[model samples]
Target chain A: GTVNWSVEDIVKGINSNNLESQLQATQAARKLLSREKQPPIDNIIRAGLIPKFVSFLGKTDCSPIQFESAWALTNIASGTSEQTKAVVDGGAIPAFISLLASPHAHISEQAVWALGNIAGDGSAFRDLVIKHGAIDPLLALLAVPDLSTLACGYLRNLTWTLSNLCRNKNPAPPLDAVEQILPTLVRLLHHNDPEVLADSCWAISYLTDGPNERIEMVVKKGVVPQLVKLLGATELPIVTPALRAIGNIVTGTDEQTQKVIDAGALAVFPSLLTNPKTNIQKEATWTMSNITAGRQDQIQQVVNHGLVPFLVGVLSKADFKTQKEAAWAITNYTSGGTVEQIVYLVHCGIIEPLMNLLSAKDTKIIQVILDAISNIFQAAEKLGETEKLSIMIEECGGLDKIEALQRHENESVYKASLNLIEKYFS
Target chain B: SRGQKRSFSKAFG
Candidate 1:
């Protein structure tokens, strides 16, 4: 049985003088590790196969052996984090890092793929991969046109590896590496491969989703225009991640959100609002929600771009997930918006659906609707139109719906509903 | 604050 090979036999074969013997051993290890059902790989680890794989990574004269060794190690890393930790502790990091420069692209590709699985295991291994200088060669690989072309399978694995490295937190990227990688990543957004574009956008999303300082650095790299251009890609794989990156970017400072606006993100939202994919519509709506969370003029820009009609329509009829986003967008606009903006939302027909959502079982949704209604009342007061707005709420059956929420189990919901009634409906 | 208010009115009005 393929699975019945003793750990001793495998280890002995891996250490053999004949190149063919070592290759067969490594390939068997890869096969066993990749199986849907397998014996504990820890036995193989205990037999000291990890150090043997690390040694093969340095065999520059034999690319197939290097590739097989890296391929086996990659599958091992794909197992439990403890297993990956064993590979890391076996001194595989430097070996894999050095292999990133292999003249043979397939060997380099396998090494990068293996390191990616290591980094993807957890933040500890990710930081270890970074500490060993993986970023430079990864970025260098991006610059090689032949290696990065759409026809090259390794480029996809390489970009995916870069994406995994970027997906860390608790403490983010090595700050210097982020700065080094930003422009090259922005360049990859224009690559002919959609997977490359997707992975690049995913990396940007992770980078931007960090603290204010990191977000500022990403914004300063002039990513907004390229990201906005990617929004027009018809491929959902490309467009979805691009929207996610834009969504994360707008969550930064006011100036950062303004950068996205200046990049013409507003013109792109109308079609996204009606995209056939719910996630696309949700992300687009979430992006607008954050935009509304910006200064009044930015909110006005969203409203001015004719987003109100589509937002209200989505709120009324889209799936629950999209409805929540649409509701959240309207809530932000109403909460932070000017009297004129709130008036515009009302004019576009956001009131009826908002009132209708008061009975939603989710407390967050209920709270947002209450807050939106309360904000609308406050806005109306500023415009000396509180009576007119109150009439509309009453006609839409908002008063009773709001009254029902006064007993909600959540204190915030109960309090918000009480305030809405006490301040206005009474 | 005053600048924003003025811009808001100018932009919306």
Candidate 2:
């Protein structure tokens, strides 16, 4: 016969001086918490189980108990913010941080998993984990070849936790912390584990995504070469973040974008335009969008890579999101690109899709499409080919769509449409 | 003038 244990009985069992009793109680609690249909977690919290588990983490020699305790806290962290806050307030972070260096591999890995959940809870708890000196040990773990080789699963957990800490949106990790871990993050980009590679790239993306100072820090660490190297990874999970990191780098100043270009991003990036995954294509196009955003020479570098044909080809694909990114890339080239570059886009077959997108409902998409058309019309004017360009637009059925936008509501769209119609279509 | 306002989405978006 089995006894249905109350929350009180579980707490008593955890509090017992017997190590076996503590381990059983914590494991049962962990199992209950992990179930698809969970019990009222708030009830468990009310019974002081959180603090008891924190106590188990403090035991110097209780690896099994520590594992169960960390497992319980990790699940608790998966609960509401208040439940996660309870784990943090119960003082589990320092213990978790200490456990990152545990003698038992399982205990160390479990602690990493528990800390990951806490950090993922949000910025406040994430900062608390960082505040307790978690980064040094985590970075040190990456330096150990055998530990990662033997405990690759937890290394993934550790890198994921580090990525979350950097991924915070509302209040990002402090710049100092970003700078502290950057060199290691760049090194981790070369790691063999796809997950580790993905998370490490994500961290670089987050760090470089803001203030020019941080972007410069990551750039000075020479991440571009590694990032371009990662562009060859066939795994989407790996490629997505790698592209995001490169995209962020290209968003920096001319010197920074050029660094990525010099690293051979242009040579490899165009092939990704045809990747089977729409998201990969989207990210690849997004990176091209940023690359084209650079100075005239950089924009020309993109054109020189023979990307215009692919960019134009992407517009008719079923994914409107990717189409929008492709349009943006064209927009940047049209606006910033040289007359020769503009003529090259026209020759690359941008007109038909440029006209097709004129029917788009998104005002932003319509605006870029108009911008590209206007640039082409102006380029034709400069090259004394206005009549020829107008004939091309009409051939693509663009004249009617351009005229249709004369009544568009958005001021930008209306003006752009009116400009195109008056200058070329009309 | 048309080109000037078109710069809005170009430089920022």
Candidate 3:
């Protein structure tokens, strides 16, 4: 199940003018990953038997195995977590990370993925990993007009790991070590690759988590609408982290929220409603709720565009968390006596879903649904739909003590929910 | 000066 070429055979293939031997060696090496069990090549590692492999790294004259050897060395270096550490401890990290400078796509991808795996372990590798001049390679790959798909995935994984390394809130690593990579990371957010776009959004969101200056810098990168657009792109597999990124970015600024809305993000939610994937739908709803936070005119914009009906339709198959988000968004949007819009939502038979959310195990959903019902009742009173108002009130547990508006100890959610609820009652 | 600009554009392109 493993590559049939021995170390001597590979060396001989490269030494002689044996084209067939070189091609066969390359194929066997690429198939190493598919092997049921690979034999150990510690002798190759420890004895500094890197002559043929290192030659392959820059052997433009050799057939494909020239690049393939570099790739194979990267694979062998990254064979196991222990193996990676041993190689890095033996000074392979800088050399492997430097392969970012290689002109060969195959070598570059192998190097990037190998670095990601090594970097995924901890900060011990951060300084050298970033210092190996990785940023320019990644940015260059992003800018390449005809970037291959493997190159894109390699970049995604690289950015995703770098994002993890930059997390200061966790005690794992110091942010200062990874700080130099931030500007370039910010630049990569504009990459045309959707997976890169998604991963870069996630990485930036994590990196900017509480630093106001960093957050401002990321916003300046024009990432908001693009992140939202990725959420809408049916071609790419919807990544939940990207949705989380959209939520996090908009939560930071009204300007960001408006940018997302102006980008036609509201239209995308309807398609997410019909998507068979629950995670995708949940993330879309979460993003919708976040962007609608505390902005009534924007909420009314969403409602006017039939968001409430689409959300109601979505609720038939949505999970409890999704129901809560839909209700929270509706409540937030209808907060300013936009009872006319509330009446529209009420007539759309949204009450059944809201009432159903009342039984949700998440206490936040229970409170959100009750508050939404309260808003609808306030709107119904203005519209003189007294009968329907009574029906909604009864469904929401007969009005008094509808649900404990008890805010959780989490300061942000509690305060925001109370503010939205206050607008509903007022 | 005009010739220089044309060569600059060509080389960069």
Number of the top-ranking candidate, with TM-score as the measure: 2
Name the weakest run of 10 consecutive residues (lDDT summed) in model 2 chain A. A1-10
Query: Candidate 2 on B1-13: residue-level lDDT in tens?
Result: 1111112123335
Model 1: which docking level applies? incorrect
What lDDT would each prediction earn against the true structure? 0.81, 0.79, 0.58
lDDT of candidate 1 over A382-422, digit per residue (tens): 88998888888899898888888888799998899888778
- Lowest lDDT sum, 10 consecutive residues, model 1 chain A, at A143-152
Compute the lDDT of residue A279 as modeled in candidate 1. 76
- Output the lDDT of residue A69, model 2: 84
Q: Name the regions of candidate 3 deviating beyond 4 angstroms.
A: A1-69, A76-83, A103-109, A120-128, A137-215, A223-230, A238-244, A334-343, A371-391, A395-426, B1-13
Every model: Cα RMSD to truth? 5.1, 3.4, 11.5
Full ranking by DockQ = 2, 1, 3
TM-score of candidate 1 to 2 decimals:
0.89
* All DockQ scores: 0.04, 0.10, 0.01
For model 2, residues A280-368, the per-residue Cα lDDT tens digits are 78777777887777788877777778877788878767488889888888887887778898898888888888889888888888988
* Clash count, one per candidate: 0, 0, 0
How much is A370 displaced in model 1, in angstroms? 1.6
Which portions of model 1 miss their true places by more than 4 Å?
A: A1-9, A15-19, A34-43, A145-151, B1-13
